Design an enzyme around this catalytic site. Structure first.
Site, PDB file in Angstrom:
ATOM      1  N   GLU B  79      -8.321 -59.670  -5.796  1.00 30.33           N
ATOM      2  CA  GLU B  79      -8.898 -60.974  -6.065  1.00 30.33           C
ATOM      3  C   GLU B  79      -7.876 -61.978  -6.531  1.00 30.33           C
ATOM      4  O   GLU B  79      -7.112 -61.732  -7.449  1.00 30.33           O
ATOM      5  CB  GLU B  79      -9.969 -60.830  -7.150  1.00 30.33           C
ATOM      6  CG  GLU B  79     -11.122 -59.932  -6.750  1.00 30.33           C
ATOM      7  CD  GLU B  79     -12.018 -60.508  -5.659  1.00 30.33           C
ATOM      8  OE1 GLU B  79     -11.887 -61.702  -5.322  1.00 30.33           O
ATOM      9  OE2 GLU B  79     -12.878 -59.751  -5.154  1.00 30.33           O
ATOM     10  N   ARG B  89     -27.305 -62.526 -10.023  1.00 26.93           N
ATOM     11  CA  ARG B  89     -28.398 -62.425  -9.054  1.00 26.93           C
ATOM     12  C   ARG B  89     -29.507 -61.484  -9.527  1.00 26.93           C
ATOM     13  O   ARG B  89     -30.667 -61.668  -9.179  1.00 26.93           O
ATOM     14  CB  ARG B  89     -27.808 -61.939  -7.717  1.00 26.93           C
ATOM     15  CG  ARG B  89     -28.756 -61.835  -6.563  1.00 26.93           C
ATOM     16  CD  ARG B  89     -28.028 -61.326  -5.315  1.00 26.93           C
ATOM     17  NE  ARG B  89     -27.344 -60.035  -5.471  1.00 26.93           N
ATOM     18  CZ  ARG B  89     -27.950 -58.849  -5.468  1.00 26.93           C
ATOM     19  NH1 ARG B  89     -29.270 -58.757  -5.334  1.00 26.93           N
ATOM     20  NH2 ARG B  89     -27.231 -57.737  -5.610  1.00 26.93           N
ATOM     21  N   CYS B 142     -18.078 -58.465 -12.571  1.00 28.19           N
ATOM     22  CA  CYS B 142     -16.691 -58.346 -12.108  1.00 28.19           C
ATOM     23  C   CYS B 142     -15.927 -59.641 -12.310  1.00 28.19           C
ATOM     24  O   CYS B 142     -14.860 -59.653 -12.911  1.00 28.19           O
ATOM     25  CB  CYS B 142     -16.640 -57.914 -10.648  1.00 28.19           C
ATOM     26  SG  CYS B 142     -17.265 -56.234 -10.349  1.00 28.19           S
ATOM     27  N   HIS B 166     -11.766 -55.360  -5.754  1.00 27.06           N
ATOM     28  CA  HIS B 166     -13.081 -54.890  -5.308  1.00 27.06           C
ATOM     29  C   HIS B 166     -12.897 -53.853  -4.191  1.00 27.06           C
ATOM     30  O   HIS B 166     -11.942 -53.900  -3.400  1.00 27.06           O
ATOM     31  CB  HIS B 166     -13.965 -56.006  -4.800  1.00 27.06           C
ATOM     32  CG  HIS B 166     -14.768 -56.693  -5.849  1.00 27.06           C
ATOM     33  ND1 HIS B 166     -14.534 -58.004  -6.214  1.00 27.06           N
ATOM     34  CD2 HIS B 166     -15.876 -56.312  -6.521  1.00 27.06           C
ATOM     35  CE1 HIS B 166     -15.434 -58.379  -7.104  1.00 27.06           C
ATOM     36  NE2 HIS B 166     -16.274 -57.372  -7.291  1.00 27.06           N
TER      37      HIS B 166
HETATM   38 ZN   LIG Z   1     -18.087 -56.424  -8.599  1.00 28.19          ZN
END
Ligand SMILES: [Zn+2]
Ligand SMILES: [Zn+2]
Lengths: 212, 213
Positions: B79, B89, B142, B166
């Site tokens: 990332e 979510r 995350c 990830h």
């Molecule tokens: Zn994640």
């Protein structure tokens, strides 16, 4: 509200760009929003100056930029732009900035101040695939959204700004196995719904986050 | 002799396993000249920052490298950046669901990882594995963790290097979901190993690993 809606020129050997195709088909008035349309070159060096000059010559309450996100399967308003250009391919001027800050005096990221969740849900309410994206990429689209955020930060405090990516349209995926596309008419319908949801009111805090 | 803290997460969202932790457990304790410590983090917005704070205050690490599951992704993805927002979510494992909340009001809008993310990405690719540099870590626990690490580096630990990788679902997590990609655990472990091997204090590569979307 007077809205500047932009689409991009074809690039990466395509002879069409769904962002501009969709923009061309939008109605000139959508509810109480009056729409001006502008085709932007897919060019890192030219886009900011075109935007600067356009805002200097006309009063816009909103700038809403549309772009192609080849490979995506939904219409996606963008939450945020980041202060970096990292081009996988050259742009239409054969310029390929890699790991370059966009504005050294700008923030590391700018969040769109349009009601991005309301716009996303408006697309979903029409029965169309819609999602709130948290990366606009690192090509000309992100650059444009970033520059709009920089302008709102430094020069145009009341400006509302955002970006919506759209999928390829069907004609673009011949020879691209398993690549999603969406009929142009659907894209136009989704963009129309998103524009209808634009206002100066607070965004809707719906459960539209991305959870892995 | 670089000391790296590598973290993985607890299972969440009705899953019985989380491939991030399963992979981290299988990593060697030395990868190149890097000494590896492992820590399992709860999938909890409220608990992770405190655990990380206490761990970094009590131990000297040169690098914190957090691993997480990205269900639906088809590559191992370092990332580039974390953003200053929580937008869950679903609820976390403590039934907490922050929606459109700043992570640290006094922090930057975003923090870029200061690990050589392109070197890491390319190292994965060099092993013959799908690898890509991701430009969004999501808006769940995350991203929160990556952001908090960036915040700590900004405000307290200037010499710390930090990042996030990830990983896909493993195949046992996608039974009956044939349109959902996965990667065998042993391949995830190989890719993480390659990414860690590429870590150093040197300038990152500037290969053409950007994205147009
Ligand atoms: Zn994640
Ligand atoms: Zn784009």
């Amino acid at each position: 509200m007077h809205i500047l809606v932009t689409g991009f020129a074809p690039f990466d050997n395509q002879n069409i760009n769904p962002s501009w195709e969709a923009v061309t088909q939008l109605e000139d008035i959508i509810g109480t929003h009056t729409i001006d349309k502008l085709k932007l070159p897919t060019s890192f060096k030219k886009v900011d100056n075109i935007i600067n000059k356009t805002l200097a010559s006309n009063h816009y309450d909103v700038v809403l930029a549309i772009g192609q996100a080849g490979g995506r399967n939904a219409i996606t308003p963008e939450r945020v732009a980041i202060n970096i250009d990292d081009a996988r391919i050259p742009d239409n001027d054969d310029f390929q900035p890699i790991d370059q800050a966009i504005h050294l005096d700008g923030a590391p990221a700018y969040f769109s101040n349009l009601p991005v969740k309301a716009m996303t849900q408006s697309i979903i309410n029409q029965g169309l695939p819609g999602a709130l994206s948290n990366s606009a990429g690192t090509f000309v689209c992100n650059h444009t959204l970033y520059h709009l955020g920089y302008l709102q930060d430094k020069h145009y405090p009341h400006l509302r700004f955002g970006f919506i990516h759209v999928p390829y349209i069907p004609e673009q995926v011949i020879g691209k196995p398993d690549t999603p596309s969406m009929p142009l008419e659907k894209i136009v319908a989704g963009l129309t719904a998103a524009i209808e949801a634009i206002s100066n009111d607070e965004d809707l805090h719906l459960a539209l986050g991305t959870t892995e």
